Amino acid sequence: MISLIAALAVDRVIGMENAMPWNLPASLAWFKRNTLDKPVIMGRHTWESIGRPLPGRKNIILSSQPGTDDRVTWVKSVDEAIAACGDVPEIMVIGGGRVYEQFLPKAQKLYLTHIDAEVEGDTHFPDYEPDDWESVFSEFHDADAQNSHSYCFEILERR
Amino acid sequence: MISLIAALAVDRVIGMENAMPWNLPASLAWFKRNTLDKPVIMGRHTWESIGRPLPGRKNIILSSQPGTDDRVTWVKSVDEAIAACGDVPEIMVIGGGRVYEQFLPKAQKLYLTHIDAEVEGDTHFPDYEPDDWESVFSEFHDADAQNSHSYCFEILERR
Numbered sequence: 001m002i003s004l005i006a007a008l009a010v011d012r013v014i015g016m017e018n019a020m021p022w023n024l025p026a027s028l029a030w031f032k033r034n035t036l037d038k039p040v041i042m043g044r045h046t047w048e049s050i051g052r053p054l055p056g057r058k059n060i061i062l063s064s065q066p067g068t069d070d071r072v073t074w075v076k077s078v079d080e081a082i083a084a085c086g087d088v089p090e091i092m093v094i095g096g097g098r099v100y101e102q103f104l105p106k107a108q109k110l111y112l113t114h115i116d117a118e119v120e121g122d123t124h125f126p127d128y129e130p131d132d133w134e135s136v137f138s139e140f141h142d143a144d145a146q147n148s149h150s151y152c153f154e155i156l157e158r159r
Numbered sequence: 160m161i162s163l164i165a166a167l168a169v170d171r172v173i174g175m176e177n178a179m180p181w182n183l184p185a186s187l188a189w190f191k192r193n194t195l196d197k198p199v200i201m202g203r204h205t206w207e208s209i210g211r212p213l214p215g216r217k218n219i220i221l222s223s224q225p226g227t228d229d230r231v232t233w234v235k236s237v238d239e240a241i242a243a244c245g246d247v248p249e250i251m252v253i254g255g256g257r258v259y260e261q262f263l264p265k266a267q268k269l270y271l272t273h274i275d276a277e278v279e280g281d282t283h284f285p286d287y288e289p290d291d292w293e294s295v296f297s298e299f300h301d302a303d304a305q306n307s308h309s310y311c312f313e314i315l316e317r318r
């Protein structure tokens with residue numbers, strides 16, 4: 001089963017290249033809890049923003065360009081990315097935009113962090129008609145001394 | 160001598176009700192570099208925001224209220240704060256607003272990170288007179304894959 005995990009600002013704006021203007025360690029903990037011990041597929045820009053292999057996960061980079069680093073798996077197509085995962089219960093696709101667009105059709109679950117931040121951006125998370133998806137869990141949190149903005153975790157299942 | 164080290168958004172904003180809406184590991188690395196192996200003096204709110212004692216530094220908390228952690232030194236006056244420092248070449252004051260206000264008058268140097276972020280602030284860095292300070296180092300950087308906003312590091316020495 002393929003799942004997409006994303007952090008979205010108002011209007012579904014997502015990061016493109018530069019780091020997003022927010023500080024949400026609680027959201028990063030949610031991210032870690034949901035991807036640990038699973039294969040993660042990301043595009044090149046996401047890899048650069050991360051800056052190192054995520055520990056405890058099989059890191060797969062989908063890109064047309066060459067594999068800089070030997071610590072991760074470089075793939076050139078969706079098929080190859082899938083194959084590289086082997087046979088596991090759940091594959092996590094962590095972005096960016098183009099990567100999400102390529103896997104959404106095959107996706108069965110969405111883990112989303114909705115953040116109350118108005119960011120100007122070009123890229124948006126693909127349009128999902130939540131009537132093709134059942135929202136199964138939603139939990140809101142206010143901003144605090146450690147988290148810059150209000151955020152809401154949501155899990156949606158493909159119906 | 161005493162030095163103040165701070166991260167200022169536009170209009171000299173240093174703090175908000177919640178965590179600052181930025182992600183700047185480069186600025187945190189500059190903060191680490193310049194405070195390592197030195198005593199650091201902070202107010203209670205800054206302490207609570209950090210969450211733990213800063214490694215490799217002597218952590219001194221200036222507050223009217225009682226000590227909640229055995230890992231740090233709790234002081235009740237600027238005078239006591241200074242004394243707790245011992246015989247060191249440089250004492251770093253890391254905030255917040257009220258602490259900076261109390262130490263500015265005794266400071267000989269400022270290490271500033273100016274960040275291009277427009278935010279409604281709660282607390283601001285005390286107004287400094289540009290005629291009283293000399294900039295001896297400046298370095299600009301744009302936002303990138305890991306840093307959400309452009310910033311510039313500056314070190315000023317009292318004329």
Ligand SMILES: CN(Cc1cnc2nc(N)nc(N)c2n1)c1ccc(C(=O)N[C@@H](CCC(=O)O)C(=O)O)cc1
Nearest residue numbers: 005006007027028031032046049050054055094095113
């Ligand atoms: C830029 N980036 C991509 C990123 C960030 N937040 C997301 N958040 C959500 N919800 N979804 C994503 N796909 C997502 N992707 C990053 C950057 C750093 C780490 C990271 O350091 N993660 C550590 C946890 C934090 C830490 O140890 O500092 C981990 O083990 O996952 C993760 C993703």
Ligand SMILES: CN(Cc1cnc2nc(N)nc(N)c2n1)c1ccc(C(=O)N[C@@H](CCC(=O)O)C(=O)O)cc1
Nearest residue numbers: 164165166186187188190191208209213214253254272
């Ligand atoms: C909230 N806060 C106060 C803070 C933040 N940035 C600043 N930046 C500058 N330039 N000046 C300050 N006084 C300053 N103070 C913090 C929070 C965390 C860490 C921190 O984790 N510092 C690690 C470095 C970062 C890391 O390991 O992620 C250190 O060793 O100094 C420091 C200050």
Ligand SMILES: [Ca+2]
Nearest residue numbers: 293294295296
């Ligand atoms: Ca100069």
Ligand SMILES: [Cl-]
Nearest residue numbers: 043045046096
């Ligand atoms: Cl990407």
Ligand SMILES: [Cl-]
Nearest residue numbers: 202204205255
């Ligand atoms: Cl404080």
